[PDB]
């Protein structure tokens, strides 16, 4: 059966000064998805054809520099993965001699070292997000329009986005995390009360460590879900609200950045939610095998 964690992609970290969210999965930064989105915008305008060069050079290099940086933390990833496997598995934990409190402190120490690595290696890469943003603003300046900028491309991307929004199963995600968090908090309370009568500390501790990680992943799931829900709601409102045939060149610049930001967050969250949903499914099978070991 399932008793070991094989994937620890769920850990993430955010920047302290500019607050970029870093995922262990490509494209690691949601802003890359925005640069991907600007390719679709740029293919519809004669003036900004030069962005195909910018994306193929600056954007994709940043992507590959980001994946390389994440790879620099594979060692710190395996080090914290080894502690997870030890703390979650009673049979594996009994093979060593340190207390559960000692190894839990090492886990916290190695978890932050790995999370800190993901940020420390990407600091130079994160500095590129700003300069690519401004480079896209100046690129949108070369539009020949002034007060006559047609919004056909703007609302055409919105119509496509409403189709792509329906492909992600939001209702299924919401129903899952509600029943999951419900069951999770019950087992946490059940473990707290049967703990005093059963003299099996190792298995209970293995259950409590799994519940600790489950709590972390539940938080990441809930964070991205309502972020997904927000970008879906805002872009939907844009489809329902006013539909001007033309705007100024600066309103259109804000337009593309706004829907590009909302859509980049939606697919970044969609990437994370698919990963996190696999982590919660996995941790639940582990905690179930542990409960069967405890009661049985």
């Amino acid at each position, epitope marked *: 059966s399932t008793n070991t964690t094989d*994937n620890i992609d769920y850990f993430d970290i955010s920047d302290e000064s500019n607050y970029y969210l870093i995922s262990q999965l490509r494209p690691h930064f949601s802003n890359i998805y925005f640069f991907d989105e600007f390719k679709r915008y740029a293919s519809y305008h004669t003036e900004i054809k030069r962005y195909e060069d910018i994306h193929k050079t600056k954007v994709n290099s940043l992507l590959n520099e980001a*994946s390389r940086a994440i*790879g620099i933390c594979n060692r710190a990833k395996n080090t914290v993965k080894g502690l997870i496997n030890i703390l979650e598995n009673p049979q594996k934990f009994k093979t060593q001699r340190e207390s559960y409190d000692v190894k839990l402190r090492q886990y916290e120490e190695k978890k932050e070292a790995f999370r800190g690595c993901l940020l420390n290696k990407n600091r130079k890469n994160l500095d590129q997000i700003k300069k690519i943003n401004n480079e896209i603003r100046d690129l949108l300046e070369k539009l020949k329009c002034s007060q006559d900028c047609q919004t056909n491309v703007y609302f055409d991307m919105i119509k496509i986005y409403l189709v792509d929004f329906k492909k992600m199963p939001y209702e299924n995600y919401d129903t899952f995390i509600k029943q999951y968090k419900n069951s999770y908090l019950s087992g946490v309370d059940m473990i707290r009360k049967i703990e005093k009568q059963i003299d099996n500390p190792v298995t209970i501790n293995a259950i409590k460590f799994t519940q600790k990680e489950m709590g972390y992943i539940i938080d990441r799931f809930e964070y991205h879900l309502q972020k997904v829900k927000h970008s879906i709601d805002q872009v939907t409102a844009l489809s329902d609200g006013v539909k001007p045939k033309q705007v100024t060149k600066n309103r259109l610049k804000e337009y593309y950045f706004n829907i590009g930001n909302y859509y980049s967050i939606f697919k970044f969250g969609k990437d994370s939610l*698919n990963m996190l949903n696999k982590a919660l499914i996995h941790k639940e099978k582990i905690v179930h095998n542990l409960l069967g070991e405890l009661f049985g």
Partner: antibody
Amino acid sequence: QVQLVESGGGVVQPGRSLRLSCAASGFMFNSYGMHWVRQAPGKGLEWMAFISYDGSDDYYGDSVKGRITISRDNSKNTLFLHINSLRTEDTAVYYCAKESNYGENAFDVWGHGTMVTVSS
Amino acid sequence: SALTQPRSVSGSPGQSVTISCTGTSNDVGFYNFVSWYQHHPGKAPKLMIYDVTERPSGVPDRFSGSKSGNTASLTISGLQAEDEAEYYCCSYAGTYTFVFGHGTKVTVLG
């Protein structure tokens, strides 16, 4: 009990299109990226394409870019591979592969492959 | 695009072998994402090493993975009859692309 079963191979005429299938089971298909790998009779393994969990993103190798299309149907747990115009060099064994559980930079499960023989 | 592998390596049962896999500064040398797959006749290829050094569950300790510069390596200690197969290295090539090696036939000499 993770199984990948390739299909659609055999004797195919050059200059025509071909669609290969990969039936997946034993794991949550809609949650993983998938890859198409091929091996020529006398050569090594060649990476062709990748498609994301929900099929919204597809990427290709330089030697097959513009010649093939990777696609999936997550309601039937099946991966597809479309060769636009078959050449003689397409004679090969085409492997279906699942993104690995330990991370997205490896593939932990492969199919047995299906033989594509191009001749007129 | 191609990673260069030795065509043939061999050893008697119980000793070691080493399969090199020389890449470029854009694949093997750029990432810590080299893979190793074992392939037997008529069998599905099998992942033996991921992320340069890590082994999937069920892969014996004899199989070892390292990397230096643009060259990754696979070391098989204490060879057995089961180890006779084709081995392929694999490395992330950037922009969601991978690249496999030519392939090395391991024969345990009888």
